[PDB]
């Protein structure tokens, strides 16, 4: 009765996730592994393979290249932000919250969920790009100049640990609903109807991992730790911004690399 209602909440969340996010983890993994119909992604692993890429213009200046990448990738994230907002309205009790608190919770949670979406696109060797038609290597990203080599390596590091948990789309829905309903965000008017939906969401999650991963070991706690890791990736972005502002120049970067980085986050 209590546990039946937990399972039903889990189900409702998963159908509503399926409906809000066309790019599921299962579809990204099919692309990556090779279950795919359509031709495999093109691999970019060096400058020669970069330039043999015409599957995707004007003249950015050294001390703006990075900022313009960051702006570029955030503006390209709007579709993702709208899908997460769509999903969020489906979480029971959400739209019942004070409109101001709905916006607040999305404004913070959206960054963390985006990194969860990125981990789907990653494996230990690299990341899908250009709507899943290309694949950029981890080693090549890391090789690049100046401050750019350290943009993505810490995101890879997280994704590899997060992807080792082997969550599927039905676990991810609940996990994502939990992130959104975080009682601690800055400026929340009423931090308690929020904490109460979350607690209910934690129970369903706890049950979901028992049913779905009956072999596993502290999966629930390991997954709750990742919420902390997600916040740190977001806050680490502020430090990175400082590093750009006073680097030993130059920060030119081939256009096509700029284009590639705007598909990341």
């Amino acid at each position: 009765p209590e546990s039946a209602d937990l399972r039903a909440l889990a189900k409702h969340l998963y159908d509503s996730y399926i409906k809000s996010f066309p790019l599921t983890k299962a579809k990204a993994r099919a692309i990556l592994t090779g279950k795919t119909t359509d031709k495999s992604p093109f691999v970019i692993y060096d400058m020669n393979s970069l330039m043999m890429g015409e599957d995707k213009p004007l003249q950015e200046q050294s001390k703006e290249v990075a900022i313009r990448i960051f702006q570029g990738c955030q503006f390209r994230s709007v579709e993702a932000v709208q899908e997460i907002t769509e999903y969020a309205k489906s979480i029971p009790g959400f739209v019942n919250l004070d409109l101001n608190d709905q916006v607040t919770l999305l404004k913070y949670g959206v960054h963390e969920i985006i990194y969860t979406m990125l981990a789907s696109l990653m494996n230990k060797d690299g990341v899908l790009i250009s709507e899943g038609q290309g694949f950029m290597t981890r080693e090549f990203l890391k090789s690049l100049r100046k401050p750019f080599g350290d943009f993505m390596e810490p995101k890879f590091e997280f994704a590899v640990k997060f992807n080792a948990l082997e969550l599927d789309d039905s676990d991810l829905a609940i996990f994502i609903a939990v992130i959104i309903l975080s009682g601690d965000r800055p400026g929340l008017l009423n931090v308690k109807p929020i904490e109460d939906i979350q607690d209910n969401l934690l129970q369903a999650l706890e049950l979901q991992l028992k049913l779905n991963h009956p072999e596993s070991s502290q999966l629930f706690a390991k997954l709750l730790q990742k919420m902390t890791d997600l916040r740190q990736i977001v806050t680490e972005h502020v430090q990175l911004l400082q590093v750009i502002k006073k680097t030993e120049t130059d920060m030119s970067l081939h256009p096509l690399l700029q284009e590639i980085y705007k598909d990341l986050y």
């Binding site: 709007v78 932000v81 907002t85 769509e86 409109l99 709905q102 916006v103 999305l106 404004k107 959206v110």
Partner: peptide
């Protein structure tokens, strides 16, 4: 100029 909140607010409505 309209930021992240605005796109969130427009999608909620």
């Amino acid at each position: 100029n309209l930021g992240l909140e605005d796109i969130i607010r427009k999608a909620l409505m």
